[PDB]
Amino acid sequence: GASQFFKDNCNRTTASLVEGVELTKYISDINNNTDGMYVVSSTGGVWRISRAKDYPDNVMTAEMRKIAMAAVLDGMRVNMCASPASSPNVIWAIELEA
Amino acid sequence: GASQFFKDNCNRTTASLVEGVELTKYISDINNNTDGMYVVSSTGGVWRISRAKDYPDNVMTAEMRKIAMAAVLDGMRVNMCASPASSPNVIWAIELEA
Amino acid sequence: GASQFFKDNCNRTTASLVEGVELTKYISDINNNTDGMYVVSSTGGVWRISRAKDYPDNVMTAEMRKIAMAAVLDGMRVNMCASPASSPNVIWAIELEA
Amino acid sequence: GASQFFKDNCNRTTASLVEGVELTKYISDINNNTDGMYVVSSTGGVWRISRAKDYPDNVMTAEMRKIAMAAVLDGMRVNMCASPASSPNVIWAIELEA
Amino acid sequence: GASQFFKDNCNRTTASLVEGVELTKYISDINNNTDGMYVVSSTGGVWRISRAKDYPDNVMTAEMRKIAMAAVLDGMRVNMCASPASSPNVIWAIELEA
Numbered sequence: 001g002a003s004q005f006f007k008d009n010c011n012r013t014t015a016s017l018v019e020g021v022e023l024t025k026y027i028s029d030i031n032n033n034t035d036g037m038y039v040v041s042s043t044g045g046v047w048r049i050s051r052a053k054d055y056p057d058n059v060m061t062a063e064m065r066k067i068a069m070a071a072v073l074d075g076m077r078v079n080m081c082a083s084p085a086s087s088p089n090v091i092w093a094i095e096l097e098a
Numbered sequence: 099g100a101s102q103f104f105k106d107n108c109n110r111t112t113a114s115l116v117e118g119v120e121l122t123k124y125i126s127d128i129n130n131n132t133d134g135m136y137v138v139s140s141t142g143g144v145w146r147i148s149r150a151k152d153y154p155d156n157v158m159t160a161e162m163r164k165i166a167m168a169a170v171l172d173g174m175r176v177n178m179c180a181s182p183a184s185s186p187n188v189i190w191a192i193e194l195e196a
Numbered sequence: 197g198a199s200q201f202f203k204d205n206c207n208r209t210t211a212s213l214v215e216g217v218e219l220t221k222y223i224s225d226i227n228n229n230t231d232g233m234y235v236v237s238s239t240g241g242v243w244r245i246s247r248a249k250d251y252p253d254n255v256m257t258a259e260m261r262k263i264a265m266a267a268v269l270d271g272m273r274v275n276m277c278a279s280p281a282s283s284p285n286v287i288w289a290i291e292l293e294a
Numbered sequence: 295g296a297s298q299f300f301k302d303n304c305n306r307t308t309a310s311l312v313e314g315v316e317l318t319k320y321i322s323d324i325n326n327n328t329d330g331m332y333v334v335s336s337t338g339g340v341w342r343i344s345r346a347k348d349y350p351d352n353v354m355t356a357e358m359r360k361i362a363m364a365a366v367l368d369g370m371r372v373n374m375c376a377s378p379a380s381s382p383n384v385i386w387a388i389e390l391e392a
Numbered sequence: 393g394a395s396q397f398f399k400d401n402c403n404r405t406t407a408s409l410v411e412g413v414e415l416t417k418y419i420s421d422i423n424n425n426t427d428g429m430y431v432v433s434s435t436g437g438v439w440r441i442s443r444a445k446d447y448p449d450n451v452m453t454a455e456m457r458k459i460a461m462a463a464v465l466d467g468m469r470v471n472m473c474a475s476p477a478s479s480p481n482v483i484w485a486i487e488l489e490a
Binding site for chain 5: 199200201202205206208209211246248251252253255256257259260262263266270272277288289290291292293294
């Protein structure tokens, strides 16, 4: 389950906590309309991973992609802090769990 | 099978979807006529991976190479959205499947 | 157990030595108040990973993250040199143990 | 076996094709006279991996290193297209085979 | 053992050849007095990994880190060519063995 730290951090924002997601697809797309990085869960939930050109968010977003692709490759769960009502929702924080 | 999101995204473009591809070779080549990154499937299909110098497609294209390489290393399938306008066809989107 | 080398170095600073930590969560966050990379241990300690934009510490901090994330993926223990001056405590050196 | 694509591409050059090579050493060296990345095979052949500062061969040469290390780490074979104009011969293209 | 090539490149003794090393600790440290990347062997030896800001040695020193990291994670042996001019000795070349 999300650490208490990760829960509390997400609770102080308007984004929503999503716990124990199994991500099963990892997507890179450069098509004009859908240019971005996305993940899909075992039940078809789709999320876009945040991106940032500059330091220091270019580091946190690169680490978001690493977390996302390790979850897909290794079958580990993630907890997410992201939009609740859209599709795709965007990820603003992500927790990889062992 | 490709996620619904990935198929919808490819359907908005001039490219074609290829599903459940087993990639068995990953190539890097700096020869004058043959400069690029490529993948080869179990069936003999050949695709060129897109590249991009600048933000933000420098991000997506780096992840396309990670996805390609992981598919070869781990034996995971990929779904591609690939343009027939060149030869090898150029990957415009790729989905790694757990 | 921490190397003597690693202990002695941390003893040159105001930080404390934390040994044999099992990290089980790896977090990337870009929300405004909690922008950063973090780890959580099996007993619920939380640390922030240092960051740096420029050479040479851009290298050292990129490896701290690699270390932290391999620890979470693979269950290896880490030793930390972590300052207790802030919450969460900031990692200033880390040692991955095979 | 090398893909027909990889083989045709190498045949367009003055370089030589070397197929099914087992790499057993991956070397980084910054000594004055041998400054470079090299690989050694099971039969004692040695090759120097290409490098490039500028886009887009900075991408291709990075992926060549990733391929050579993965080969060493995971015992996968490679096919190389290597120029005998210097010694160690230089890798102008490399194909990782699953 | 070390490849003949790696041996011959270290030789001349201005530097020290260390063969068959098992690395069991990998260290990142940003404290100013001891800022660097280091490794610790099973016998308790400690080395500093070289660093470099500019091309092309920024590539080799990045690969030295990867090799050091892989040795610790995976238990692979390395051979080193290190300078006895300082303590810890500085790795000027490293060979990862399959």
